[PDB]
């Protein structure tokens, strides 16, 4: 993250900024991660250094949680619980030193953590241990505003540890599923049917052609994102066991309600029936 204060004061709206696959070539970073509140973790200069870290983390987490609730228009629902889960997870990887963003102020935080837990070859074990001891309280802190200010989120699911790439694929899948129907709706509004007895509208109608171009650009980003994320999953998996999850697709099948692998690959490769009907002249 290249900012420190602002992202602890407000969040950009959902899918306002798409996943970023260009900053670091072998991963795509979600806007939520870029904006993760880490103000206190950044600006901080033994058993007590750990204690001070705990206080700072508790406070950054409570603010992050509050801002995620606000981002969701104060709705206490699944979208909120998932966001809490994703951000909690990212805090965990930051603490454990296995976060994949590593941009700007995230580097400062990592330096601070190395200053705290040290850098020897058993430091990583200590960081993981400290996280496992603290994670339940960090989750609880993220739920502060919901408890205190607001007028169904499950700890156990939230604090269960899995690699960041797994979690990011879950979050990505849920974004994709939300975006698809919207993008299709925009297409149908302009491209449904024919312009004459024989030719689809996309053959001649500029607004439809523009619409197909916009869809093309969107689906091309989705394809690129799946490509990058799914391959990061494989490389991470090869270099590291999770029961029930063998392929990146298994994550989507388990996270999403109605996933179908063949249909999904059809969609992101522009060979699904609906896209062809609407956007392919012949």
């Amino acid at each position: 993250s290249n900012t420190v204060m602002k992202n602890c004061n407000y969040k950009r709206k959902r899918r306002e900024r798409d996943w970023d696959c260009n900053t670091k070539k072998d991963v795509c970073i979600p806007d939520r991660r870029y904006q993760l509140c880490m103000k206190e973790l950044t600006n901080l200069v033994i058993t007590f250094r750990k204690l001070y870290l705990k206080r700072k983390l508790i406070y950054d987490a409570a603010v992050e949680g509050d801002l995620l609730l606000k981002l969701n228009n104060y709705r206490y629902n699944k979208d909120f619980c998932k966001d809490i889960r994703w951000s909690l997870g990212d805090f965990g990887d930051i603490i454990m030193g296995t976060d994949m963003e590593g941009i700007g102020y995230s580097k400062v935080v990592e330096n601070n953590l190395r200053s705290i837990f040290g850098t020897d070859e058993k430091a990583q074990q200590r960081r993981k241990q400290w996280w496992n001891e603290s994670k339940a309280q960090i989750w609880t802190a993220m739920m502060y505003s919901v408890k205190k200010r607001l007028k169904i989120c499950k700890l156990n699911v939230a604090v269960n540890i899995e690699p960041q790439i797994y979690r990011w694929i879950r979050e990505w899948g849920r974004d994709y599923v939300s975006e698809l129907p919207t993008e299709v709706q925009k297409l149908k509004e302009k491209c449904d049917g024919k312009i004459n007895y024989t030719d689809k509208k996309v053959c001649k109608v500029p607004p439809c052609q523009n619409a197909c171009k916009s869809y093309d650009q969107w689906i091309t980003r989705k394809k690129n994102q799946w490509d990058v994320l799914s391959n990061k999953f494989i490389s991470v998996k090869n270099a590291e066991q999770t029961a029930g999850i063998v392929t990146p697709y298994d994550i989507l099948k388990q996270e999403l309600d109605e996933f179908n692998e063949v249909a999904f690959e059809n969609e992101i490769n522009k060979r699904d029936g609906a896209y062809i009907e609407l956007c392919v002249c012949s």
Binding site: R55, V63, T140, K147, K148
Partner: peptide
Amino acid sequence: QLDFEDVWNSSY
């Protein structure tokens, strides 16, 4: 705008 003390004591 969150009160640290209240947050700290609420988190346990």
